[PDB]
């Protein structure tokens, strides 16, 4: 409603770096807000795509940002009569970024890994890796839980059970308020998908450079399964956290699985031990129900609510014809220990191939009326197909069915305006929470400041 679409702030990165693929707000130790931006196709030292991360200070003018530097050199270690190998070419550093406290977690879902022992090998596979940084102190650390040293022959004998070679860890990410990093890995367990959790503080204390393979005892991974309903389900494509079991000492995890059960798609709510509390099933096949998940209390009853994006949902229309527009599902949490029922509200796109629901960002309370609000992206929507971001306001019964404000892309065609979103943070310190929108196709980020209500 009260975002300012006239005076925007534009940050920009190198041409072809996909600057804006991921973003988040980062507060330093003094509470000063900045913007962390991922660019998964930034060039490295060898003039080869490796990805990169930028830390943008808040300026109303915008402009260029300084790099948040990471090691981009392929590593090699000959230990234990084996040879460990990391490969950072086309790893996609910055395909997901997230901030917690004064720490930044940027991930390279496609960092490759291989282990050589004489003539055998573990196979060169994308285990992924996340780089952690404390910008004020310069501390650095890494976390790659799916790295293994088991040779290729062994996996074949055991029928590819507990195969973490293609995790792509860091594909999606989130950090609990307590400081436990949770990585979605949609390729883990031979493309079933797994989650990996570990406290940030233990990642730093247990990491040393050049080791490549090290233990993090406090870490916790999800479990493999022989159920074909999970096969090729990409469990971990998106991740989120919230309070869904009425126990405030426990933290619950929300996981998207957009090809679960033969591309029906699903979202599951679990405890910190990966025991399934509830499962939302997709409405339509190939709709990619689970592509994005968001957790926020929209109806102001203190109980978190769930939002699921199905960006390829095909709405039924006249003459038995379908039209791919995208859809968002809202689930309100019931009072006390009870199952989440049917969706409370269905938001359906309008523009063909617009992918309404590709990203869903909690905004906090935008108009300051006591109800938290959200923003939904349609990166190829709008009458021109350049992209749109729609704002839906909270209310006592859930969300409003019609948007309060529509942000049309200020970028050219193909910018993927809205592919990444992030809100609920007041960056200019005017009392109103603001919205940052990524457009990796144009290598830019647009900042929308919220202003008093008119």
């Amino acid at each position: 409603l009260n975002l300012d679409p006239v005076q925007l702030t534009f940050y920009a990165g190198p041409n072809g770096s996909q600057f804006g693929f991921s973003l988040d707000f980062h507060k330093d130790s003094h509470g000063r807000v900045a913007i962390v931006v991922g660019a998964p196709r930034t060039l490295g030292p060898s003039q080869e795509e490796t990805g990169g991360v930028f830390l943008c200070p808040w300026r109303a003018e915008g402009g260029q940002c300084p790099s948040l530097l990471f090691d981009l050199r392929d590593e090699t270690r000959n230990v234990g009569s084996q040879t460990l190998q990391t490969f950072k070419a086309r790893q996609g550093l910055g395909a997901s970024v997230v901030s917690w406290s004064d720490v930044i977690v940027a991930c390279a879902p496609w960092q490759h890994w291989n282990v050589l022992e004489k003539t055998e090998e573990a196979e060169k596979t994308p285990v992924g890796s996340c780089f952690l940084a404390q910008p004020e102190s310069g501390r650095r650390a890494e976390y790659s839980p799916c790295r293994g040293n088991t040779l290729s022959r062994i996996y074949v004998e055991n029928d590819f059970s507990w195969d973490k070679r293609y995790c792509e860890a860091g594909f999606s990410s989130v950090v609990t308020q307590a400081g436990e990093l949770v990585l979605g890995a949609p390729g883990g367990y031979y493309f079933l998908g797994l989650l990996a959790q570990a406290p940030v503080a233990d990642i730093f204390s247990s990491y040393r450079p050049g080791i490549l393979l090290w233990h993090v005892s406090s870490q916790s991974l999800s479990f493999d399964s022989s159920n074909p309903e999970y096969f090729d389900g990409y469990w971990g494509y998106s991740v989120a956290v919230g309070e869904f079991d009425g126990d405030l000492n426990t933290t619950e995890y929300v996981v998207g699985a957009p090809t679960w059960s033969w591309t029906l798609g699903a979202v599951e709510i679990l405890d910190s031990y990966y025991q399934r509390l509830h499962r939302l099933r997709g409405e339509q096949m190939a709709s990619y129900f689970g592509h994005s998940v968001a957790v926020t209390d929209v109806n102001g009853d203190g109980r978190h609510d769930l939002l699921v994006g199905a960006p390829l949902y095909m709405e039924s229309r006249a003459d038995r014809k379908l039209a791919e527009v995208g859809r968002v599902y809202l689930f309100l949490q019931p009072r006390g220990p009870h199952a989440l029922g049917a969706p409370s509200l269905l938001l359906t796109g309008t523009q063909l191939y617009g992918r309404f629901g590709s990203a869903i960002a909690p905004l906090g309370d935008l108009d300051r009326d006591g109800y938290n609000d959200i923003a939904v992206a349609a990166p190829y929507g709008g009458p021109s197909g350049r992209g749109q971001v729609l704002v839906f306001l909270g209310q006592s019964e859930g969300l409003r069915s019609r948007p309060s404000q529509v942000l049309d892309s200020p970028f050219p065609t193909g910018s993927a305006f809205g592919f990444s979103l992030r809100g609920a943070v007041d960056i200019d310190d005017n009392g109103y929470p603001d919205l940052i929108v990524g457009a990796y196709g144009a290598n830019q980020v647009a900042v929308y400041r919220a202003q008093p209500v008119v």
Partner: antibody, heavy 119, light 108 residues
């Protein structure tokens, strides 16, 4: 805290067999590699072998191929070292070892099991 | 197998001295070496791993260094507890092999 609690000292005769144990305390034995080391005053320290208790796969020094047999039961959270056809040279102290962070290191050590072979 | 030549076999030193133990390998091991301490009539405690990294709980007066096939363990300002046995161990290749050992003795 990480502590490795081994069995009590053994006193056996030559030709017989003995099975030492190494119980994990404060952690799961399945987490890391578990090595066995042999110590003697003259010969010093010698590496026997290792086992991954998550799957049971083992590696050995070719010198101990035959006498040493390393196993692990995740249920009782314990790792074992069996020695067969015992000899006066098998009189030594035996330590089970695990690493701290590095997958291939030797950082945490049990108190050690004293073995004495004699007729 | 890789031979670990540890030297010296023993040294007589006093409290507060800065001493250095060395360990030479038959081939390059690229910092895949650890250091160990065995106090008299007791078990082993890890000091260093990967050539330089301290084990948790170890004081900072200890320090490891070296590269290729020649490494070192240094103790700045000896304490009364530091008089004990010290061993190096390489884990670059299987089988793991240890050094002969070094015993720090009180000088008088």
């Amino acid at each position: 805290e990480v502590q490795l609690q081994q069995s009590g000292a053994e006193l056996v005769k030559p030709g017989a067999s003995v099975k030492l144990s190494c119980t994990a305390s404060g952690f799961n034995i399945k987490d890391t590699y578990v090595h066995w080391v042999k110590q003697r005053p003259e010969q010093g320290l010698e590496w026997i072998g290792r086992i991954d208790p998550a799957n049971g796969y083992t590696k050995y020094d070719p010198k101990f191929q035959g006498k040493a047999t390393i196993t692990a039961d995740t249920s009782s959270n314990t790792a074992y070292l069996q020695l067969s056809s015992l000899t006066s040279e098998d009189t030594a102290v035996y330590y089970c070892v695990r690493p701290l962070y590095d997958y291939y290191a030797m950082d945490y050590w049990g108190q050690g099991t004293s073995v004495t072979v004699s007729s | 197998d890789i031979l670990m030549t540890q030297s010296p076999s023993s040294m007589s030193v006093s409290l507060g001295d800065t001493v250095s133990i060395t360990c030479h390998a038959s081939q390059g091991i690229s910092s895949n070496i650890g250091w160990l301490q065995q106090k008299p009539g007791k078990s082993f405690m890890g000091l260093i791993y990967y050539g330089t990294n301290l084990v948790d709980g170890v004081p900072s007066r200890f320090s490891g260094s070296g590269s290729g096939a020649d490494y070192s363990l240094t103790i700045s300002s000896l304490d009364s507890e530091d008089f004990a046995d010290y061993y190096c161990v390489q884990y670059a290749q299987l089988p793991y092999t240890f050094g002969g050992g070094t015993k720090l003795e009180i000088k008088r």
